[PDB]
Design a protein around this ligand. Structure first.
Ligand SMILES: CN[C@@H]1[C@H](O[C@H]2[C@H](O[C@H]3[C@H](O)[C@@H](O)[C@H](NC(=N)N)[C@@H](O)[C@@H]3NC(=N)N)O[C@@H](C)[C@]2(O)C=O)O[C@@H](CO)[C@H](O)[C@H]1O
Ligand code: FES
Ligand SMILES: [K+]
Ligand SMILES: [K+]
Ligand SMILES: [K+]
Ligand SMILES: [K+]
Ligand SMILES: [K+]
Ligand SMILES: [K+]
Ligand SMILES: [K+]
Ligand SMILES: [Mg+2]
Ligand SMILES: [Mg+2]
Ligand SMILES: [Mg+2]
Ligand SMILES: [Mg+2]
Ligand SMILES: [Mg+2]
Ligand SMILES: [Mg+2]
Ligand SMILES: [Mg+2]
Ligand SMILES: [Mg+2]
Ligand SMILES: [Mg+2]
Ligand SMILES: [Mg+2]
Ligand SMILES: [Mg+2]
Ligand SMILES: [Mg+2]
Ligand SMILES: [Mg+2]
Ligand SMILES: [Mg+2]
Ligand SMILES: [Mg+2]
Ligand SMILES: [Mg+2]
Ligand SMILES: [Mg+2]
Ligand SMILES: [Mg+2]
Ligand SMILES: [Mg+2]
Ligand SMILES: [Mg+2]
Ligand SMILES: [Mg+2]
Ligand SMILES: [Mg+2]
Ligand SMILES: [Mg+2]
Ligand SMILES: [Mg+2]
Lengths: 110, 215, 108, 168, 77, 119, 150
RNA sequence: CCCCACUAUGCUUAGCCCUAAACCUCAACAGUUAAAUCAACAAAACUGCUCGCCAGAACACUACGAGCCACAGCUUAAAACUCAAA
RNA sequence: AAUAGGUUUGGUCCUAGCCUUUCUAUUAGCUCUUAGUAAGAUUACACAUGCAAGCAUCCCCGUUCCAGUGAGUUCACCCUCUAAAUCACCACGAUCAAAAGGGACAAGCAUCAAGCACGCAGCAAUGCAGCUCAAAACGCUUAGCCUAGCCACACCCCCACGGGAAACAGCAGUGAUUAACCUUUAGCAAUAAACGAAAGUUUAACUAAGCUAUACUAACCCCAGGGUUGGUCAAUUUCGUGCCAGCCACCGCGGUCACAC
């Protein structure tokens, strides 16, 4: 009703950013194998519009379907960078982390 | 999933539409009638057996109006089929005429007018149908006043009819199921439905035309 | 094989069943060309009546006439069917007795 | 036997044992878990057992997993309105996580019965047709009604062959 | 059945279907029954049409439909 | 499938084997085949009398009122089944064909009487 | 119609029986010729064990057996295969009487592959391409396609 | 096959070729020695995980195609005919 | 492949393939009593003849449906939007549903591994250099499909101005072709469709019949045949033949005692 794009919200990973104001995103979904009854990732490429070209290869992003595709393949837009590559803020504490270790102790600000 | 374009289906479509607009048959060709065989030479189709009498006697609208100063503007034209069926005055007030110039006697064309069916005038003038029919008759000027004279009779009529038996039984069971207790009858409001006669002039401006396929 | 290996490959693809001399058809119509005999492979010893016929498909194969005795001649019409002749290698077609020119084996 | 550890997961009976049916809001689900550590043990078991059950019930919901990106595991759902729901699942068992997301984002037993009852009105018993859709194909299967001519030959008076000959 | 491009038969070229004979009484009486029947059925049709609008409007903007969307949204908060 | 023009109609879809007619009331497109694809099945009609001597007519009044309010027409046989039930008025031709049958049977009683009277 | 089918089956059965009797005399002669040789082929090894015969029989094959003849039939130059296609049955039976009065087989044989009624078809061209014959269409036509194929 | 003589070659430098019964015929990682030990033989039997490969014999370390400093080459690699076994 | 069986060897075990027993559908041969029901060209090759679309007071509408076929083949499903159409009508919204947009969707071959312009931005000028693909792009071959049904085609050139050229893939029927073979019936009485204000008219749709062991159901005083008979696998008397003639699904039989011809 609000948009003609099937996928309204999808989370992916920026594989490449070689187009102006556009980010190539790889989205993975779990598809069941009817015979083995096991879930496997079936990936798909999405073209997102990044006005400020703030995306970096390797970061997780959130896409929001546009009302109507602005281009032949661009159907979404960059809603927000979930995990910035190398600079992710733990949502539970809001503190920087470099893997499974805190770069800034959570106790600094109690 | 990239459909291979079909250009010849679009080129032909434009050409066929264009030819239908430049070779279109006129009213003189479409609506001509052989009065001995009672067929339409254009298509070779016999008329119905109930029309044959009237195709040899009455006149078409524009073989009456082609004898008048401005194709009979502001004049009343009735129809033989109305005078027999309905006593009340039924007529069209002519307001605009588009004659067919390709007829040698200018006996075809179109006409717009104000209908007055059974004494009830219409607010605005639309296009007249059944121009080609052999059923028309022109109201003389001096009779225009005694032909138009009409007094409306009382229109009192049934306003509500019963529901059919089963529906009525199901309308009285909802009431009692919901708890409502009443002794009134369910009745249908038939005052909205204005039943018009089957011979009421329809709209000729939403009606089609014969294709240009002469036979 | 692992589940990941089984997912990439997929359902086993059954080799397309090959067709025989009848091209997957019950019978076939053919014209007799020759009428010779062939010897079985060891350890069987006999002379088996066979015939080279050109089928309606266009090919020209060797057929085996069953029964005791026959009167098949060049240009005749016979209905062939499948069924390998075990003694004769390379003979995969059998003439239908009682059809077209070929007639039922006379009793005794 | 069935390959892999815990092969019962790859069964229709186990995939249909999930009681977590998300609402229409839930569009994307993200699971962040740590491969090692005692605190993250429940999340690892949640991804090993329960994730298949959720995706089977919610096939149009995207479920993405990320390993060792943060010091602690957490779940985050993305609704269609733009709201993000963070669920810290550290120091928790897999059963608690499955019961926690069924209360804040899952449907109850009342809302699910209604859906199933709507599908019972699509298959009317009175309707006649193929066995796939309807119970009976014709009304000759109903005791009392004239049987099919295949099983019981009709009387000569009810057949159009003799009627025509009888008439002329 | 035939199409538009199929030629007509040569046995029907000279065929004229004469209309049936008319009984003045029955025909006039039968023309009024249809007049009333169709007026009684047009009113029912409108009634049935009026029940389909309500139901449609009683599900998206109804009092019992807007009272549950707030209950579902209040429980979500 | 898409048809140029057309509309919906509540008609009868003939079924059953030879000399055993069974109709099943359906709402279907005007241009669709008699026993082809249908939108919904609204009942069934068994012409042949049963052991008890009655003809069974199933009517889904609730769904018949929905499709009549969506723009569906009615066929003459289906308009005569609802007049017999009491959902619709008696079709004019059900009343006129009953009057013709009366005159017919009253015209034959004269001959029968005359024969027994005159002869 | 079924009564008609019964008569035809009886007539075909009667015809088939007659042919068999003519063929039976052919076979009975053909079988006897081989049986005479076989009963005379093992007179040399009379009252001997089969194993004894095998050794001599295997050696005997070398002495008196020449190279095997080709199974494929070898075309003869002075042979004419003809396919007669007529328009009416009575006209075809008139051309067969002219081929039944041919007495020059010593110089050139004449083989009537196939004879029928109707226009030249594909089965006629295929039979003439198999036996290297000629198609003689008496008062019949041959479609362009057939001409191209031939 | 035995004896004698001698060459390419084996060696160095610089390029190529890219093969082996390249076989410890027993994949990499982690782990166990309990239970039914385990067809046989050989170098006891198993578990988890992953990659690679394989589904009668022969045709076939072939043919075609592609690629390659390889032009009697290497790699990859079918089918038809045939057997009822190997 | 199953409750399995037979067959490798001098012999045993293991592995493995072929076959057997089960159930259907064509066709062939020999044979065949009736009744009722269902189904019913081999072929997108060519077609004599006849019928298959009319209605109606002249306009319109309809003949764009049904019926048919299976050549080709990821247009069939969901969402969004929104024409035509029905609900008498203006309006309303509902229903139905195309085009357009987004998504999804056959099989085999990787000895089809690279495609070759397949992208983005920007009001525009125009600029940047991209896009798809070993999770199978591009390509080749095959095939109607996911069956209350749907898709597609409608002599051919995808299309149909135009050209070739003169069309049964409508019913019945024919020729050719194939192992493959239904009547050149009747009636609009029921239902459906079309037209009409309507009574009504029309309809090779359909209905009711015809032919045919293809199949199911039922029956019969008289009326039974076909194929088997070494083992697997139920069941052979006596002659004749003498590795000949012949036989078998597999293993195998027959060389003067053949339960195998
Ligand atoms: C159990 N049967 C064993 C098998 O016999 C087989 C044997 O079959 C042979 C084929 O006929 C021949 O074309 C095939 N010849 C080929 N050029 N392919 C022989 O290889 C084959 N023998 C075999 N594979 N051992 O001869 C056949 C007639 C046999 O009797 C059929 O059943 O093989 C034999 C030895 O070859 C044994 O003696 C038999 O015991
Ligand atoms: S199935 Fe109901 S009559 Fe044959
Ligand atoms: K033997
Ligand atoms: K070694
Ligand atoms: K097809
Ligand atoms: K085409
Ligand atoms: K009728
Ligand atoms: K009309
Ligand atoms: K004996
Ligand atoms: Mg054998
Ligand atoms: Mg030297
Ligand atoms: Mg070494
Ligand atoms: Mg390795
Ligand atoms: Mg092999
Ligand atoms: Mg080598
Ligand atoms: Mg090589
Ligand atoms: Mg090569
Ligand atoms: Mg043995
Ligand atoms: Mg075995
Ligand atoms: Mg048979
Ligand atoms: Mg159709
Ligand atoms: Mg509209
Ligand atoms: Mg569309
Ligand atoms: Mg190749
Ligand atoms: Mg095809
Ligand atoms: Mg075309
Ligand atoms: Mg044709
Ligand atoms: Mg036909
Ligand atoms: Mg024929
Ligand atoms: Mg058949
Ligand atoms: Mg007729
Ligand atoms: Mg029939
Ligand atoms: Mg015997």
């Amino acid at each position: 009703v609000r948009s003609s794009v099937h996928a309204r919200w999808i989370v992916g990973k920026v594989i490449g950013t070689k187009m102006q104001k556009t980010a190539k995103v790889r989205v993975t979904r779990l598809v069941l194998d009817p015979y083995l009854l096991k879930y496997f990732n079936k990936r798909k490429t999405y073209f997102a519009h990044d006005a400020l070209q703030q995306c970096t290869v390797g970061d997780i992003v959130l896409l929001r379907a546009l009302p109507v595709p602005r281009a032949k393949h661009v159907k979404h837009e960059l809603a927000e960078i979930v995990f910035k590559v190398g600079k992710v803020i733990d949502p539970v504490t809001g503190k920087p982390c470099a893997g499974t270790t805190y770069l800034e102790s959570p106790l600094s600000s109690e | 999933k990239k459909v291979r374009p079909r250009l010849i289906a679009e080129l032909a479509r434009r050409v066929r539409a264009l030819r239908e607009q430049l070779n279109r048959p006129r009213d003189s060709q479409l609506y001509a009638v052989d009065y001995e065989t009672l067929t339409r030479p254009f298509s070779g189709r016999r008329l119905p057996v109930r029309a044959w009498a009237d195709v040899r006697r009455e006149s078409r609208l524009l073989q009456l109006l082609g004898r008048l100063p401005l194709f009979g503007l502001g004049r009343l034209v009735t129809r033989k089929s109305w005078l027999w069926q309905h006593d009340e005055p039924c007529y069209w007030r002519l307001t605009r005429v588009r004659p067919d110039y390709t007829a040698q006697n200018l006996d075809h064309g179109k006409a717009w007018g104000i209908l007055t069916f059974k004494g009830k005038t219409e607010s605005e003038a639309r296009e007249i149908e059944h121009v080609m029919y052999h059923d028309w008759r022109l109201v003389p000027k001096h009779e225009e006043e005694a032909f138009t004279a009409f007094t409306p009779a009382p229109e009192d009529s049934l306003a509500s009819v019963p529901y059919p038996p089963l529906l009525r039984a199901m309308i009285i069971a909802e009431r009692q199921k919901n708890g409502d207790t009443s002794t009134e009858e369910p009745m249908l409001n038939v005052q909205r439905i204005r039943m018009e006669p089957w011979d009421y002039p329809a709209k000729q401006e939403d009606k089609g035309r014969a294709k240009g396929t002469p036979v | 094989a692992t589940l990941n290996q089984m997912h990439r490959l997929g359902p086993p693809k059954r080799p397309p069943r090959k067709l025989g001399p009848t091209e997957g058809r019950p019978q076939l119509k053919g014209v007799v060309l020759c009428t010779f005999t062939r010897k079985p492979k060891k350890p069987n010893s006999a002379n088996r009546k066979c015939c080279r016929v050109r089928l309606s498909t266009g090919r020209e194969a060797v057929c085996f006439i069953p029964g005791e005795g026959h009167t098949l001649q060049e240009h005749q019409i016979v209905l062939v069917e499948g069924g390998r002749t075990q003694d004769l290698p390379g003979v995969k077609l059998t003439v239908v007795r009682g059809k077209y020119d070929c007639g039922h084996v006379q009793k005794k | 036997p069935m390959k892999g550890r815990f092969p019962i997961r790859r069964t229709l009976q186990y995939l249909s044992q999930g009681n977590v049916v998300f609402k229409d809001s839930v569009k994307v689900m993200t699971v962040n878990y740590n491969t090692h550590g005692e605190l993250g043990e429940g999340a690892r078991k949640f991804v090993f057992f329960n994730i298949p059950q959720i995706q089977y019930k919610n096939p149009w919901v995207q479920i993405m997993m990320f390993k060792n990106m943060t010091p602690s595991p957490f779940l985050r759902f993305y609704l269609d309105s733009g709201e993000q729901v963070l669920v810290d699942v550290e120091t928790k068992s897999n059963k608690e996580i499955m019961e926690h997301i069924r209360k804040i984002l899952g449907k109850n037993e009342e809302t699910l019965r209604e859906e199933e009852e709507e599908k019972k009105q699509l298959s009317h018993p009175a309707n006649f047709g193929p066995r796939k859709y309807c119970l009976r194909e014709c009304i000759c299967e109903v005791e009392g009604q004239v049987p099919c001519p295949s099983l019981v030959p009709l009387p000569k008076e009810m057949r159009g062959k003799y009627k025509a000959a009888l008439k002329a | 059945r035939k199409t538009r491009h199929d030629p007509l038969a040569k046995s029907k070229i000279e065929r004229v279907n004469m209309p049936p004979a008319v009984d003045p009484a029955e025909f006039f009486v039968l023309m009024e029954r249809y007049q009333h029947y169709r007026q009684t059925v047009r009113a029912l049709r409108m009634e049935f049409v009026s029940e389909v609008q309500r139901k449609v409007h009683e599900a998206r903007a109804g009092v019992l439909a807007e009272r549950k969307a707030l209950k579902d949204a209040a429980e979500h908060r | 499938k898409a048809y140029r023009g057309g509309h919906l109609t509540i008609r009868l879809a003939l079924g059953g084997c030879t000399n055993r007619p069974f109709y099943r009331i359906v709402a279907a497109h005007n241009k669709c085949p008699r026993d082809g694809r249908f939108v919904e099945q609204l009942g069934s009609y068994d012409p042949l009398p049963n052991s008890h001597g009655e003809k069974l007519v199933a009517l889904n009044l609730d769904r018949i009122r929905h499709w009549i309010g969506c723009g569906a027409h009615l066929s003459k046989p289906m308009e005569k089944l609802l007049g017999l039930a009491g959902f619709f008025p008696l079709h004019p031709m059900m009343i006129t064909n009953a009057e013709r049958l009366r005159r017919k049977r009253a015209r034959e009683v004269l001959l029968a009487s005359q024969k027994t009277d005159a002869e | 119609e079924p009564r008609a089918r019964e008569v035809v089956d009886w007539r075909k059965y009667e015809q088939e029986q007659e042919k068999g009797q003519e063929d039976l005399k052919i076979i009975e002669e053909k079988r006897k010729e081989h049986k005479e040789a076989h009963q005379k082929a093992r007179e040399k090894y009379g009252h001997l064990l089969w194993k004894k015969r095998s050794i001599l029989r295997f050696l005997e094959r070398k002495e008196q057996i020449p190279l095997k003849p080709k199974e494929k039939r070898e075309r003869d130059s002075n042979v004419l295969s003809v396919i007669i296609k007529g328009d009416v049955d009575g006209s075809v039976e008139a051309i067969l009487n002219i081929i039944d009065t041919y007495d020059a087989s010593h110089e050139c044989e004449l083989e009537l592959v196939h004879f029928g009624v109707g226009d030249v078809s594909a089965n006629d061209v295929n039979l003439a391409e198999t036996f290297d014959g000629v198609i003689y269409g008496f008062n019949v036509n041959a479609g362009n396609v057939i001409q191209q194929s031939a």
